[PDB]
From Swiss-Prot, chains A, B:
This is Polarity suppression protein. InterPro entries: Phage_P4_Psu (IPR010006). The gene is psu. Late protein which functions to suppress polarity of amber mutations in the late genes of the P2 helper phage. The keyword NADP does not apply. The keyword rRNA processing does not apply. The lineage of its organism: Viruses, Duplodnaviria, Heunggongvirae, Uroviricota, Caudoviricetes. Coiled coil: none annotated.
Amino acid sequence: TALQQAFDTCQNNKAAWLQRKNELAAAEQEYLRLLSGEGRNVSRLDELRNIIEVRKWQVNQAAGRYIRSHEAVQHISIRDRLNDFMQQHGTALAAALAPELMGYSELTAIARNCAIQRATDALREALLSWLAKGEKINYSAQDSDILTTIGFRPDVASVDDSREKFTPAQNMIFSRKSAQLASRQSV
Amino acid sequence: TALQQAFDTCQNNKAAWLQRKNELAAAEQEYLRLLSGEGRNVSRLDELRNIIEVRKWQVNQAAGRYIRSHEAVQHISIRDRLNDFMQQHGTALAAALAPELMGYSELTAIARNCAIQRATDALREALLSWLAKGEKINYSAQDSDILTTIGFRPDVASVDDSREKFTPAQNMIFSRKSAQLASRQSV
Ligand SMILES: [Hg+2]
Ligand SMILES: [Hg+2]
């Protein structure tokens, strides 16, 4: 399913994000070791300084991509579970909304928009009243394992990491440097 | 119930509106009979001209009041039937919306607004997809007799009748003249 793929991608993206944070930390650590020593490796320091800049960008990109993949999983589940819900109870729901919705398949564009907006306001009010009961809400059983596994929201750390904005021109430079970093043989 | 009262009021208001339209027509008819005759009852004509102006205002007011009472019946039924719906299926609906709604009773004001808006967008999308099936929508069985009796929408005649706007100052004058018209003994 699309949901399963979306979950595999989210899990992959979260790992990539944490991997980048590890790599950055490893570079920061080597840099600091050199700053703390007696030597003065001008070129190694300069190269590490460049690497650190690249890793920060990678952390930022990975964090954003992870957040979007996380939201994608939830978005797909909601859509799909709501479709199943309407399959079971659409008739009763529409019937309750009949004074707004009856004759929908015959309405003009302008009429359909009004009808949907008003039906939507009524639904919102009903949802709000039900929510006020304070009943605890669990995930749909069908998607509970996946939704539980991914967590309710991405950690704020990923939001902090992706806050910085990079232009397309910057992404061009950094994506080039990333590829260069990826083909480096350590020696 | 509030719905039963609202229906009694709608039925009353529709009758009042048609009654006013009859009264106006009766005055217009007497006026025309006089215009078509040989006589020249200056004062009766002038009084009829005044009466006709008052009846037009009454038709306008009654029409508006009828439309609002009709919408009130539908508004109450939708609210009530949706409440019953949530009573039966709220848990499943909320569960399907869990990635948006879970933890709602704990959210800040800003968070609650976002959560409701997003849950509401998802609902709208689900409703739209279900509607695209083109299944015919009937009234909830509980309110079907009342909703059928009142009709889906007020006749456009009532919209035409209430289109004209009257200021509070005009309503003051006309409401006075209406009362005067009501205490007239015909002679
Ligand atoms: Hg994930
Ligand atoms: Hg009515």
